[PDB]
Every structure is written in C-alpha cells, then in structure tokens.
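Assemble and predict.
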Amino acid sequence: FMRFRRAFGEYSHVVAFNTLLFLMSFTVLCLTPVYSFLPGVYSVIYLYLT
Amino acid sequence: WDLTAFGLVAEWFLAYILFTRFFYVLGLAAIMQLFFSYFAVHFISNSWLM
Amino acid sequence: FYLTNDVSFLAHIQWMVMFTPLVPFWITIAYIICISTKHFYWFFSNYLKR
Amino acid sequence: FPNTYLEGSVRVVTTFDSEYCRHGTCERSEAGVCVSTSGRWVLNNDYYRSLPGVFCGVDAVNLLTNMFTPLIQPIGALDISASIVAGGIVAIVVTCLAYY
C-alpha cells in the first residue's frame, strides 16, 4: 500500500481531472431524454475542449 | 414465518409501560410521519426550506 | 467582508436562511460564487494546477 | 390539426384560437406559436406550459423573450436541469466581472 501510494502521485494529476469530465458526461447523459439535441453539440464542445 | 410486527408491538408496549414526560413528543413525531407519508404531494410546493 | 470570520459564518447562515425564498436566482448564484472563490482558488492551486 | 412549420425531432407549431382535437381527447388552445425540443404533442392551453422541454409565446419575439422566464424565477423551480442553468450564469458573471 505504501508503494502504491508513492506511485499514485504521478497519475494523480490525470485522475483528479478525469472526475470533472466524468461528472459532466454523466449529467449530459442524464439530461438526454428531454433535450434530444444535446449529445450532438456536447460532442463538438467536448472535442473542442479536449 | 415472520414476526417483525409483533416485535415492534412489544417494543411499543414496553415503551408505554415506561411512561415519561417525553413520550408525547415521540408519539407526535410518529403520527406526523404517518400523516406525511399518507397524503404528501398535495401541500408541498416551492419553499425549499419547507 | 468587513467582519470577523466568527460572526461572518453566522451572518452568511442567517442571510441564506432568511432572504433566499424572496430573491432572484442569479443573485444567489453570484453570492455563492463570491463566497466560494476563495476556496476554489486554493483547490485549483493544490489539486489541479499542472 | 394546426399547421406545422417544421417536422421531425424538433417541432414548431402555430395555432389559432380553436378547440383543436384529434383521435382521443379534446382541449381548447389559445392562439400563438409553440415549439418543443421533442416530437411530443404541444398546445398553448394550461398544463401544457409546465412540462420540461416545451416553449411557448405570443409571437416569435415574445417566445424568444419568454424563453428566459425561468431565469428570473426564485430558486426552487428546476430539479435536474438546474446545473446547466446555474453554469450559464456563473460563466457569464465570472468572465464579465473578472476580465472586463
């Protein structure tokens, strides 16, 4: 567990940032059944921000 | 067989045997919970505090 | 802003309890953003920045 | 049935003042223009201007102005879509203040 804790810090910078993106994607997926145009524009803005 | 209801009835009976000044506030909470669960919906609107 | 944190917390709690149900939403969101920027800066610096 | 300006996933309907009806039930609808983000049925009558994804207004400009009506509504009107509405104000406020 100590070795894993020491190793985790290298990828922590990506792991922390992944959470906000996952939350935004989940929110967009949840909002899909009402606004059935969101998955299109959201893909474009996602690629733009990438 | 199942006897959860009998156990709850026994608990309530033993609580009534050990009568104190604070049994009334618990009975009020129970009856309010029952009332809210029974009707609900009708008189809840706006007022996030409510 | 011109108050100690000890009374500032109570003032914020009282303002959020009392004035919330009769104020426009954008005022509340601006209040939340202005209160939480001081912690957003720290969080971004310590867990997201590069 | 009323005239339809567009058909498909996005539907735009303009109606007069008449009891428009089809196979099923009938209701009276006021004259105006209605637009919905889904292909569901839309009317200017009451109980129709409450459902999510349905927009309505007296005219084209009136509908566009009324599209922002929930934004001046007191907090406690949206449940799931509150996040995007909050973000759309937070981004504008933070930019317009912190830069300009």
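Chains A and B do not touch (no CB pair under 8 Å).
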